[PDB]
Design a protein around this motif. Structure first.
Motif, PDB file in Angstrom:
ATOM      1  N   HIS A  55       0.836  -1.194   0.000  1.00 28.86           N
ATOM      2  CA  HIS A  55       0.000   0.000   0.000  1.00 28.86           C
ATOM      3  C   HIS A  55       0.875   1.250   0.000  1.00 28.86           C
ATOM      4  CE1 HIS A  55      -2.779  -3.104   1.493  1.00 28.86           C
ATOM      5  NE2 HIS A  55      -3.736  -2.351   0.982  1.00 28.86           N
ATOM      6  N   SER A  94       0.116   4.251   0.912  1.00 28.37           N
ATOM      7  CA  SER A  94      -0.121   5.011   2.131  1.00 28.37           C
ATOM      8  C   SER A  94       0.383   4.241   3.345  1.00 28.37           C
ATOM      9  CB  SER A  94      -1.611   5.320   2.287  1.00 28.37           C
ATOM     10  OG  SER A  94      -2.099   6.050   1.176  1.00 28.37           O
ATOM     11  N   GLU A 117      -3.531  -0.325   7.194  1.00 23.94           N
ATOM     12  CA  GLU A 117      -3.016  -1.058   6.044  1.00 23.94           C
ATOM     13  C   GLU A 117      -2.944  -2.561   6.281  1.00 23.94           C
ATOM     14  OE1 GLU A 117       0.798   0.655   5.419  1.00 23.94           O
ATOM     15  OE2 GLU A 117       1.701  -0.264   7.195  1.00 23.94           O
ATOM     16  N   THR A 170      -5.533  -5.853   4.557  1.00 26.09           N
ATOM     17  CA  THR A 170      -6.337  -5.167   3.554  1.00 26.09           C
ATOM     18  C   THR A 170      -5.882  -5.594   2.167  1.00 26.09           C
ATOM     19  OG1 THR A 170      -4.862  -3.267   3.855  1.00 26.09           O
ATOM     20  CG2 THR A 170      -7.031  -3.172   4.905  1.00 26.09           C
ATOM     21  N   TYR A 228      -6.898  -4.658  -1.744  1.00 24.48           N
ATOM     22  CA  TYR A 228      -7.662  -3.812  -2.662  1.00 24.48           C
ATOM     23  C   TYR A 228      -7.926  -4.583  -3.956  1.00 24.48           C
ATOM     24  CZ  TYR A 228      -7.462   0.476   0.119  1.00 24.48           C
ATOM     25  OH  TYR A 228      -7.634   1.432   1.094  1.00 24.48           O
ATOM     26  N   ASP A 252     -10.237   0.732  -4.334  1.00 26.95           N
ATOM     27  CA  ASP A 252      -9.823   2.114  -4.584  1.00 26.95           C
ATOM     28  C   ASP A 252     -10.046   2.511  -6.045  1.00 26.95           C
ATOM     29  OD1 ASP A 252      -8.972   4.575  -3.643  1.00 26.95           O
ATOM     30  OD2 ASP A 252      -6.853   4.168  -4.041  1.00 26.95           O
ATOM     31  N   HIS A 295      -5.722   0.995  -9.229  1.00 27.51           N
ATOM     32  CA  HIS A 295      -4.979  -0.257  -9.220  1.00 27.51           C
ATOM     33  C   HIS A 295      -5.388  -1.104 -10.417  1.00 27.51           C
ATOM     34  CE1 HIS A 295      -5.048   0.872  -4.841  1.00 27.51           C
ATOM     35  NE2 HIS A 295      -3.755   0.685  -5.034  1.00 27.51           N
ATOM     36  N   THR A 304      -3.358  -6.023  -3.600  1.00 29.96           N
ATOM     37  CA  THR A 304      -2.640  -5.416  -2.489  1.00 29.96           C
ATOM     38  C   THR A 304      -2.683  -6.336  -1.275  1.00 29.96           C
ATOM     39  OG1 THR A 304      -4.545  -4.211  -1.588  1.00 29.96           O
ATOM     40  CG2 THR A 304      -3.267  -3.124  -3.323  1.00 29.96           C
ATOM     41  N   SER A 330      -0.831  -6.552   3.101  1.00 31.54           N
ATOM     42  CA  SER A 330      -0.128  -5.845   4.163  1.00 31.54           C
ATOM     43  C   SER A 330       1.376  -5.855   3.910  1.00 31.54           C
ATOM     44  CB  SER A 330      -0.439  -6.475   5.519  1.00 31.54           C
ATOM     45  OG  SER A 330       0.369  -5.913   6.537  1.00 31.54           O
ATOM     46  N   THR A 331       2.032  -4.751   4.273  1.00 35.70           N
ATOM     47  CA  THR A 331       3.454  -4.595   3.980  1.00 35.70           C
ATOM     48  C   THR A 331       4.307  -5.600   4.746  1.00 35.70           C
ATOM     49  OG1 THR A 331       3.008  -2.235   3.674  1.00 35.70           O
ATOM     50  CG2 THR A 331       5.314  -2.924   3.787  1.00 35.70           C
TER      51      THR A 331
END
Ligand SMILES: Nc1ncnc2c1ncn2[C@@H]1O[C@H](COP(=O)(O)OP(=O)(O)OP(=O)(O)O)[C@@H](O)[C@H]1O
Ligand SMILES: Nc1ncnc2c1ncn2[C@@H]1O[C@H](COP(=O)(O)OP(=O)(O)OP(=O)(O)O)[C@@H](O)[C@H]1O
Ligand SMILES: Nc1ncnc2c1ncn2[C@@H]1O[C@H](COP(=O)(O)OP(=O)(O)OP(=O)(O)O)[C@@H](O)[C@H]1O
Lengths: 699, 726, 157
Positions: free
Chosen positions: B11, B13, B19, B22, B24, B59, B63, B69, B71-72
């Motif tokens: 993500h 952001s 985040e 999640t 997307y 979103d 995308h 997407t 989680s980081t």
């Protein structure tokens, strides 16, 4: 059908305004790709980028289906050369209106006749879509009857650049001098003669060879049949073939094709005949066409060897028949690139096919200096010191090697400078960093010359033979008028006889360094090499051993039988020739007659100056101040040992040091004493006395 | 349409909790999958199972459809790698509730300043569920502490980990244990630079070179020089390049979009290239930090071979002409790792982005004990022996063992411990069992690693005590071998150029082959026996390929040394004019031996019996630097040989002084002494069965068995050859 | 079938009506090529330019699909010898009408006894397709010479 391949071709009639942003795709292809005539499509080489030009209906159907016509202005933006692959993509992104764009001029003229009442309208009537290239050649714009070039460098508000449509009032026009497009897009820049190295004679010969058939093929066809078409480039690898063929293709507006050769032939299928026939038919389709062949020797090796291949025979036969059937009046030229002339097939290298032979010689110090200055000028020299003397010193210090990966030396020097600056300034901006020469020298030493897989300070010389060698290298060459008018044959060198451990090798190295011309030593026990002496012309040839061939054994007999032909060739252009021997009594009596070996010079142990120079050079790796040696006592002790045992002494001392205290910071006198005691009196006096007797009896 | 595979994307952001968990998902994909945003979607590796992640709107259209997407940092729990293919499934079952959860911080000293007011509510406001193992960047914690993280060790109350349900006040939360999670979940573990030791010197050069481009590459922006986008990693097989690639991918915390494949091609003429073009276009658009290209030789070998240039020629040409894009600004660094260094296309190595050509060698001498201790700690901090002296001894032993061989040794030691424990305690639980040195030695004996494989033959054991000879030859050989082998920085800085080649010529039976065997046993700890006539092949081109393979592929820097039994059978072609197998192999050997000066301390050794055939286009100044006379043993050496061979006999009972026998045998050598001792022993055994002694009559009887000895003519020939050589 | 090659063949008869612009093609391959009988097709050697000719229906059965039949004229345009390789293309372009053409026979002195209308009638049967390479026989009644021929030179348009 599903056409997955497309090519480009300039439009005729010299269209103005409407020529830009137009791709006359075939109506059948246009309907197949579900794209309307009034739509934006991506045209360009596959996988690289796009240009976003508006497609067209295609007008008449006479044009070939595969080819789509594009203007020269669009092609120059992405360096789209003739015959490049093209791909059409249906998806399109709406381009936003251009705002606060800027424009520049390729030429040096700036702020002159800024009328802009038609130039601004020109950017609007040409279907919009302003690219960073915008190479303008339409109409006749001039200020005092002189052509100018206008380039819209930048327009800021997976393609080459985002598409923007020019608007009359929504953007402001600013004019400035840039001479190039903006570097933000990193668009490819066509190669020019300024960027390439000098190679004056080679580039002139290649230009003439390309130009002669290109502009006047009708006269050649009328005068006779089979005009010259094949151009062969050979020489040492790394000198530059792909770069120069790319340059000559870019500077030409004719059709070109990329023929690697492994991809043309299908392994275990035998489709090379059909592939070559299709390639040549495509070339024949358009009158201006250029044929480029890369690694032709690999594709078609020599037919004498039984391992060449049935596919090799087939491709050779089809190439021969296609060259026979290509015609004479056609405007076609074939360019072939090969690594070595020996690997070229003998049948191909015959008169009437590749008579126009182009070879690239080994660059000298002047060529290295010129290419270094050209590269430095091409690179942003806002900080780099020009320093002509430094460049000349670097070129002279470098060993003679061909212009291969020379840019890699600059690249690694830049890397070393970056590494030093990062540590020095704790990750500071590049503008605050400084570039020096020590890093460049270290990188040049580390990379080392790769041509093969000596200096006057490195190897000394004797003053007694200096005058004689200077006379032999100057009087026959510098002043040939006296010899020509008096009809006096050249001395053709002398015979040097000495022990293997004496300074004969040192004298030969000193002669080679003083001559300043690179050479390859010819071993004693070891026709093609001898023939290359005349082809090069100004050089030095040295024979390490001549005693073995004076009276393997078969190789020595062949060499002494072919020496008769060597003398005849050497008579026309003696230049300089030297040789060495160990048994003088084995030389032929007929070889001592005047006119071939006028003088005989004896060589022995090196003098005090040469010995001191060699000692200093071999001690340079070690340290002198900590060791305390005066570099003269060792020479006095080992004056009569030999001319090369000092290397053995240094090796023994280093080995002793590294086995006595592992890593070494200084060398003590004990290691030198042990090395001196290890070997004593290597040379013999009887053989030196025999040499003296031979010198006395010679006269 | 119909997207079978999807690619995750971090993500843009940054926000704690928001985040996490999640995805997307594109509305077109979400609608086509018959899943609403209020349902969990399974995402995971192609070979693994999905994970519990709630769906999102996507979103709008920012995308693309093909990308999703995630989680980081949650991906680090499952060791998920960016750019790899993912699987989506519709089946999902609601997990039950869980209690008595456990979490562990990365720092060793836990239990400090645990307010618990924010940590407890973070797991509820993150729109996620507790998973064994948790990673998050978080922010500054407490006072006087840097950014720390906590990892859920366990959660006890066909998936990679069983899902559960977490709440704030209905369950108890406790923190204990260490950073490592429970192994019963079979979850992978993150790989860091510390997980690798020894190579680190190569890693320091590679991390610096890869990093300047991957970090701020603005320095070469205005320069306009060719941009550095590769390292060209290569080395001996089994050196552990894959674990380095995984470490550099995980630590980069960025996109690792790449694919290796087993030389993946397509039947369609255009698709086999369009796949690579699409991959490179995505790489330019999606900007992965590192792109992995493994086994370049398999997918793009040299064009010299006829069959090697098929298909791959156009692929490599397009790759070369396409990688020269996005200059100055832009990382797009691609990593090329291959097993064969010389099999790569020379045109591929021509551009300057592979000028470094960083090559990683096999571990040796140093850092071996360090990596052994690191791997022992990684596998288990307990139930194992931790002795510095034992680890140092096992590292010194078997100097030719690569890191993969070390891992195999550790596995075999564990197997031996299991077998010993079972046989001792009748199938008891193995948790309490401990590792000792005996099982390590047994494993070292029984592994037979791949380093000595492909040969199937091993040299016999020999020691310095078993051989007694002229000390000068042994000292010279030790000086030749140990000095360059121990280190190379002294040789490189001081400019010392070792000959790296010795020729052993002498009378037959002088034990030059035995000397070479002892040299290999002592220092090399690795032998690569090669025979001259063996490399000869019926086919014209097979001999050159075989000799090139045995010279390059099997060569190891410090371990391996190549020994020639009879080098005099190769150079002489006898009555050979041209186009001969012997001439071809001699030319190939000369070409492959004249381009080496120091390289990797190959220090080749050759033995011969008739030196007169060696001087046939082979004797060159770079190889004749060192000459060893290898003379017959003297009286002291012969006495030592007699004493060694008579050790099994009873000298005291027999009363023989072992002196007059040596004095009488003045012109003999070690072979004749051994033969006469053997004959005397055989006669003693035959005459009166077993007697365990030798008498003077046995030696007298065996004396006539020896056929003369070293005749003076060959000795004079060797002496004059040595004088001629100088 | 997928016929990727064609071979030129001569007509069994002289075909006095239609010497030029006659190429017999099998209906099976012609149907698969999506070419109507009243459509022009270019035929020529592989790797070289093609020569356009109107498609014609095949002579029922016992006619090979591979062969294409020509009569002494289309072959002579590109010096096509019997047995040479041929290639077929469906691309046709309508040519402009000829005007101001000139004809001059080789190995023959300039004479005006041809009556200047007998050769004209032969061109009427051609029905278009005029190229600089044409070889004919001009029948008889010309100075009592059996071994004569007429060749077209070029057209000035
Ligand atoms: N005369 C020259 N002037 C400037 N740069 C040169 C010159 N010759 C070579 N170079 C540089 O060296 C590179 C090597 O040349 P090029 O790529 O054309 O290879 P080549 O010599 O034709 O190939 P091969 O290694 O197969 O012989 C060029 O790309 C260019 O950067
Ligand atoms: N620094 C290190 N510390 C510990 N083990 C290491 C280290 N470097 C490598 N290894 C070992 O090397 C092996 C890694 O194997 P990997 O999957 O990388 O394939 P490889 O055999 O090296 O590949 P290739 O022959 O293609 O280069 C493991 O056994 C690992 O323990
Ligand atoms: N100093 C010694 N100590 C012990 N044994 C020895 C000694 N010298 C010689 N020998 C014995 O003599 C043998 C001679 O060596 P080997 O049989 O390997 O032949 P070589 O001398 O290398 O000759 P060739 O050139 O025929 O191979 C040794 O293998 C060993 O059995």
């Amino acid at each position: 059908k599903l056409p997955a391949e497309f090519i480009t071709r300039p439009h005729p009639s010299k269209d103005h305004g409407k020529e830009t942003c137009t791709a006359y795709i075939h109506p059948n292809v246009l309907s197949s790709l579900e794209i309307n005539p009034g739509s934006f499509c991506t045209v360009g080489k596959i996988g690289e980028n796009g240009i976003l030009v508006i497609a067209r209906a295609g007008d008449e159907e006479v044009h070939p289906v595969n080819v789509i016509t594009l203007s020269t202005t669009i092609r120059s933006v992405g360096n789209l050369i003739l015959g490049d692959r093209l791909e059409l993509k249906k998806a399109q992104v709406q381009p936003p209106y251009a705002t606060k764009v800027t424009v520049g001029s390729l030429q040096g003229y700036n702020i002159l006749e800024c009328m802009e009442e038609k130039v601004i309208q020109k950017l609007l009537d040409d279907s919009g879509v302003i690219m960073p290239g915008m190479i303008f050649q339409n109409l006749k714009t001039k200020a005092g009857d002189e052509s100018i070039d206008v380039v819209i460098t930048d327009a800021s508000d997976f393609y080459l650049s985002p598409p923007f449509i020019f608007r009359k009032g929504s953007t402001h026009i600013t004019f400035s001098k840039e001479t190039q497009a903006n570097r933000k897009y990193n668009l490819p820049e066509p190669l020019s003669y300024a960027a390439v190295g000098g190679l004056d004679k080679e580039i002139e010969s290649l230009k003439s060879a390309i130009e002669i058939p290109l502009h006047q093929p009708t006269l050649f066809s009328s005068f006779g049949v089979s005009p010259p078409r094949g151009i062969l480039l050979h020489g040492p690898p790394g000198t530059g073939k792909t770069m120069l063929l790319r340059v000559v293709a870019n500077t030409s507006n004719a059709h070109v094709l990329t023929i690697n050769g492994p991809s043309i032939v299908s392994k275990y299928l035998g489709e090379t005949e059909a592939a070559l026939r299709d390639i040549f038919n495509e070339a024949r389709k358009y009158q201006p066409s250029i044929i480029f062949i890369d690694q032709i020797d690999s594709i078609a090796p020599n037919r004498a060897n039984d391992d060449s291949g049935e596919v090799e025979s087939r491709v050779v036969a089809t190439l021969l028949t296609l060259m026979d059937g290509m015609g004479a009046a056609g405007k076609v030229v074939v360019i072939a690139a090969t690594n070595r002339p020996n690997s070229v097939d003998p049948a191909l290298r015959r008169p009437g096919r590749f008579d126009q032979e182009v070879e690239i010689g080994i660059p000298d110090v002047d060529a290295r200096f010129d290419i270094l200055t050209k590269q430095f000028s091409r690179m942003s020299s806002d900080r780099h010191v020009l320093d002509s003397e430094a460049i000349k010193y670097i070129a002279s210090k470098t060993h003679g090697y061909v212009g291969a990966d020379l840019t890699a030396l600059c690249r690694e020097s830049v890397m070393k400078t970056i590494q030093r600056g990062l540590g020095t300034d704790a990750n500071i901006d590049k503008f605050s960093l400084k570039v020096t020469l020590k890093d460049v020298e270290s990188a040049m030493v580390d990379i080392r010359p790769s041509a093969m897989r000596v200096y006057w300070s490195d190897i000394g010389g004797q003053e007694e033979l200096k005058t004689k060698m200077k006379e032999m290298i100057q009087l026959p060459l510098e002043a040939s008028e006296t010899f020509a008018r008096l009809g006096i044959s050249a001395p053709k060198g002398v015979l040097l006889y000495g022990p293997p451990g004496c300074s004969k090798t040192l004298t030969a190295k000193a002669l080679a360094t003083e001559s300043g011309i690179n050479f390859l030593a010819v071993k004693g026990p070891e026709r093609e090499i001898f023939r290359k002496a005349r082809s090069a012309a100004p050089s030095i040839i040295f024979f390490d051993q001549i005693d073995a061939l004076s009276p393997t054994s078969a190789a020595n007999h062949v060499l002494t039988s072919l020496l008769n032909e060597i003398d005849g060739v050497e008579e026309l252009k003696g230049v300089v020739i030297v040789a060495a021997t160990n048994r003088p009594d084995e030389i032929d009596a007929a070889l001592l007659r005047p006119g071939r070996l006028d003088r005989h010079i004896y060589v022995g142990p090196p003098d005090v100056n040469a010995r001191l120079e060699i000692l200093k050079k071999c001690t340079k790796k070690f340290n002198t101040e900590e060791s305390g040696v005066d570099l003269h006592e060792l020479a006095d002790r080992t004056e009569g040992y030999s001319g090369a045992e000092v290397v053995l002494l240094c090796q023994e001392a280093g080995l002793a040091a590294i086995m006595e205290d592992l890593d070494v910071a200084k060398v003590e006198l004990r290691h030198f004493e042990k090395a001196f005691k290890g070997i004593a009196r290597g040379i013999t006096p009887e053989m030196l006395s025999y040499y003296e007797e031979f010198a006395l009896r010679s006269g």
